[PDB]
Amino acid sequence: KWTYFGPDGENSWSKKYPSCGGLLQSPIDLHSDILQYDASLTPLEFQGYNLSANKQFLLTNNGHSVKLNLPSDMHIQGLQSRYSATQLHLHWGNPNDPHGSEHTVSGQHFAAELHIVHYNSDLYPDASTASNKSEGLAVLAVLIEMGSFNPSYDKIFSHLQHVKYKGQEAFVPGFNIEELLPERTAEYYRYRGSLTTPPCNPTVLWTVFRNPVQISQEQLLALETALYCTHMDDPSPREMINNFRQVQKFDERLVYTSFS
Amino acid sequence: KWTYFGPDGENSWSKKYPSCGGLLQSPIDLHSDILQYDASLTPLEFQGYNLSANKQFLLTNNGHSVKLNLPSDMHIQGLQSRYSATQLHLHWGNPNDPHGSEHTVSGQHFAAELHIVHYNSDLYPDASTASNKSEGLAVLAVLIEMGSFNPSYDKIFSHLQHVKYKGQEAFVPGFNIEELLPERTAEYYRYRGSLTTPPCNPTVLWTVFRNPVQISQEQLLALETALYCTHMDDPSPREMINNFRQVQKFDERLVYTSFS
Amino acid sequence: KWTYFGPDGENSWSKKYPSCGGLLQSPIDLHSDILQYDASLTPLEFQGYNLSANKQFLLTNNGHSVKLNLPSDMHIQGLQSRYSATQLHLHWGNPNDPHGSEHTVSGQHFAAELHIVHYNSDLYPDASTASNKSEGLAVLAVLIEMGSFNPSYDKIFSHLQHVKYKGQEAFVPGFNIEELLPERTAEYYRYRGSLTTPPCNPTVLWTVFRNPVQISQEQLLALETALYCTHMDDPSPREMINNFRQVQKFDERLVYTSFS
Amino acid sequence: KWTYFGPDGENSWSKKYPSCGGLLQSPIDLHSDILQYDASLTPLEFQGYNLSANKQFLLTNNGHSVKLNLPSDMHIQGLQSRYSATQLHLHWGNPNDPHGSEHTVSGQHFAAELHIVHYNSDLYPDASTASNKSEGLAVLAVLIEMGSFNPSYDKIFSHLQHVKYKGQEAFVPGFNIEELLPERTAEYYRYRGSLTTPPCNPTVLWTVFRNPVQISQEQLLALETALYCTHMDDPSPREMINNFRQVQKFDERLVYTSFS
Numbered sequence A, B, C, D: 001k002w003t004y005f006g007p008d009g010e011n012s013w014s015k016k017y018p019s020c021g022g023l024l025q026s027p028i029d030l031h032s033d034i035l036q037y038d039a040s041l042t043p044l045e046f047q048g049y050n051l052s053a054n055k056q057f058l059l060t061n062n063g064h065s066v067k068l069n070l071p072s073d074m075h076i077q078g079l080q081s082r083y084s085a086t087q088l089h090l091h092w093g094n095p096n097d098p099h100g101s102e103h104t105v106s107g108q109h110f111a112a113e114l115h116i117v118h119y120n121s122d123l124y125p126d127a128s129t130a131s132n133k134s135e136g137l138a139v140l141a142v143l144i145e146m147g148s149f150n151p152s153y154d155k156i157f158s159h160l161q162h163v164k165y166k167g168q169e170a171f172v173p174g175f176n177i178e179e180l181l182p183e184r185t186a187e188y189y190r191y192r193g194s195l196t197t198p199p200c201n202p203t204v205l206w207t208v209f210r211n212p213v214q215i216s217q218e219q220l221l222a223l224e225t226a227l228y229c230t231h232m233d234d235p236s237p238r239e240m241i242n243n244f245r246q247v248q249k250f251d252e253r254l255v256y257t258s259f260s
Ligand SMILES: Cc1cc(-c2ccc(S(N)(=O)=O)s2)cnc1-c1cccc2ncccc12
Pocket: A086, A115, A116, A117, A119, A127, A128, A129, A131, A137, A139, A194, A195, A196, A197, A198
C-alpha cells in the first residue's frame, strides 16, 4: 500500500520500495543546465497505434490512476530494440491548483501528463518480465495544458464515470492513440530514469515530447473530479487528486534533446 | 547519518527520522494558486542584530552546511512571542547547476538560500527544548541570486577556506546581521512548516522575504567549491554541494503574503 | 588431495570433498538475466586495511595459490556482522591463454582475480570455526585485467621469486590493502556462495566489485610463471597455472547489484 | 541416476561415471586463444538425410532430453571413416534465462544446441559397440538463436506434447534433416572431445558449425516448457530445463577451424 498523500505518501515510499530511494529516479525538471543536444537522436515511428473501432480495450481504475490496456501489436520504432505497448495512464493535480504534470520544464508544471508504457519485445516475452530488467521499459510522456476541447482525449474521458472506484473496469472502442500525441513528435527530451510510482524500478527509457497538447477547462475539471482511490465501499473514501510525484534530484547527469 | 545524496538521501530520511514523512513539510514552491494577501501581517523589527564588533562568533562546518552561532540577545519583534536567534546557515547547488535555494518562486530556484534560526524564548528556556514543541521555532529565509558582490555576506564567506572540512571552526567578528537582509523586509511570505533537514520537526513559522539579495559569481563559486562533508584526512572526500531539499507537496493550505 | 588438472581435477573434487558437489557453489557468470538492482546494498567500509609499514606479514606458497596472512584487526564494516580478515590470495591462467579469473562477466574471463577472505568474528572465535558454519565467511573479489603497471599489486608480486615452491615463505612489509581495490567500490555484485576450492563450504557472502583493476603485461607474466605446485627438490616440477574453478550452475537464484 | 541439478548433478557425475572426471571432456568455450586454422579440413557431405516421408522415426523423452532415432543409412562423408547416424537431440535453458547451448563462442551462450550423433560404421557394427571405443563417434552441433519462426524445427517441436514425461514415445514421419543445418556448413570448428552426458566417453570427434540457425520466441518457449525429467508416476516431478553441461577446461590442446 502506497499513496500520494499522508503517512504512506512519497517521502515514505523507500520503506517498502527501496528503489524509490535509489538511482535514476524520475520525474525531473527539464532545464538548460542539464540539457544537451544529441544530433544522432532519430524520430520515433508509431506503428499499430490506429486501433480498430471494432475491437475494444480495457479501462481500469487501479487506485492510483486511470489505465487503458494496449495490445502488443502496437509498437515504437527508433530505439535499440522494438518496444511494444502495454498500457497508458494519466497524472493530474486538483481544482484549486490545476498543475499536476510529473515532469516540469524550466520549473513550470503543466496541467496533467499522459504516459504510454512499452516493454522490450525483442528481449522479453511480456511487460512483467521486462519491468525489473535492464532495457526493460520505454515510456512516452505527453505534457497537457489548458486550451481548446480535445475530441481525442474525450475518447478516454467520456468513460470515466464507469471507473469511479478502485477495481472498476470498462471497455473503450479502439481509436487512434496517435491523436493523443502533440505537434512535431520529432522534438523531444530523452534520459534514463525510473517508474514514477512504487516500485520505482530504474528500468525506463524516457521520451518527453517538447510540445504540449491541449484539453478544455471542462475536460480537465472532469478528470480531476471523476475518480476515487478507494473501493466501492472503503469506509474512508479518498478522491483521486494530486497523483503525481515531486521532481527528483538530477546531479552530474544528462538529458539529451533532439532539438537545438 | 543523513545526506543529500545516495542511500542516506532525502527519499530515505523518513526511515531514520519519521517526521520527514509527516505533515507540514518544508520547503515549498510559492506560486499564485496557494498565495493570499493578509493585510494584518505587520513588519518585523530586528533587535540586537548589530552585533558588537568587539565580540567574536563561532563559524562551523558541521558536514551538512556552514553555520554561524548567534547570541540570545538577538531577537525578532512583532510575532505572538519573542523569538531569540540561535544560528544561521546556508543552502546551495553546484557550479554545473547553480540553483540551490530551498524555496522556489513560481517554479524558479534561486542560486542559494540563507536561514536565520530563532526559538520561542518566551515559552521555552533554550532552542533545544523549543525545537520539537508547539510554536517552537521561527526561521527567516533570504533568497540569494548571482549578481553584485556583497560585502556583508563576505564577512562570512571570507572565512570559508578555513573551515573546508567537517568539524573545523573559525571566529567571525561581530557585524550587523541586518545587512544580510534584502530590501523592503516588510514584504514577505508567511506559512507554518518544518525544518528542511532531519529531524524535520513541523515546528517552524516561516518568513521568506519577497526580494532576493545578490552575491558575486566569485562568492557563489567559493561557497559551492570550498567545503567538504568529510573530515580532513578521509581517503575519499565528498564535496558539500546540492545541500538543499526538493520542494514538498502543499495541498489544502495557504501561504500568506504581506504584499499584494 | 586435489588439483586443477587431470584425474584429481575439479570434476573429481566431489569424490573427496562432499560440499564440492552440493548447493550454492561458486564461482558464477554475472550476466543480465540473473542480475537485480537492490538499493539496500550500501557501501562497505574497509577498516584497519592500512597495515603498519613497521610490521611484516607472511606470504606462503601452499601449492594451490600464493597467500598473504592478514591481521584480525582488519575488517569489513557495513554487513549485519563484523567480518575480520584472515588472508588474501589470487587465481590466474597461463601465458598461452591469460584469462584465469574465477567469476566471469557476460561470459568473459578477466586475466586474474584477487580474493580477500574474512570470517564472521561477531559469531565465531576464529576462521577455523567459522569456515563451515552459517554466515561464517565473507570474501571480496577484485577482477584483474591486463593493462597499466600497478605499484600496489607489486608490493606482493615483487616477492614471488622467493616463494617459487610449495611450502616456501617470505615476509611482506605492511601496506594499504585498500590500494588493491578498484574505483567506485560502492558498485558491486552480491550473492550467497561457497569457497571456490576444497572443501567448497557453502558459507560465503560474496562481494564482486563491478570495476576491474589493471596490472601490467610483465606483472601478469611473473604471476603466471614464477610459481610451482611442487616442492623444491622434486625432479618432476608442476607449474602453478590455471588455478581457477570453472563457473557453476546458477538457477532459481539472483545476484543483487548496487548499480543499475 | 544422474541429473543437471542438485546432488546428482554434474560435479558428482564422476562418482559413478569415472570418465566425466577424465581426459578430453566436452563442451568447451570456443575463443581465439585456442583456435587454429587448418586448411586441410574439408566440407562434410550429408547422405540419406532426406528421410522418407513413408517411414517413421521414434521420438523419445529419455529423462535428460528429447531424442529422435535415426537410421544408419544416414551418413557423413568427409571424415577419415564413414560415420552413420543413430540419433539427434537438444539442449536448452529456461524461460527466465533462455541461454542453454552447451558450446559457447567467445563466452556467449546461444539459446539452445542440436546434436546429431553418428557412429563409426567402417570400424564398428553398431552405435553401442562404437560408443566407448577409439574413433567411435562423430557429433554435429548446431547453435540455435532466437529469430524468425523455423518450420523445419517445428517438425520436431509439434510432437512435444506427446512425449511430456520420461519413457513416453511417439513416431515422427521422415523429413529432411539437412533442413536443421545452418548456412555455409563448410565453416566449422573441429576438436577431439567427449559425450557431454554420462558416461562421458572421450570418443567423440566434434564438428560445431560456425553459423547458428534461428527459431522463434514461441518455439523456444515451447521447447523449454513442454517436458519433464520424471515419469508419469513420479510424486516429485521435475521440469526439463537447463539440460546443458557447463564448459570444461581446455588446457594444452587445440580446436581447428575450417575458416581463417
Ligand atoms: C510494465 C509496468 C509498468 C508500471 C508503471 C508504473 C509507473 C509508470 S509511469 N508513472 O509511467 O512511470 S509505468 C507498473 N507495472 C507494470 C507491470 C505490468 C505487468 C506485470 C508486472 N509485474 C510486476 C511488476 C510490474 C508489472
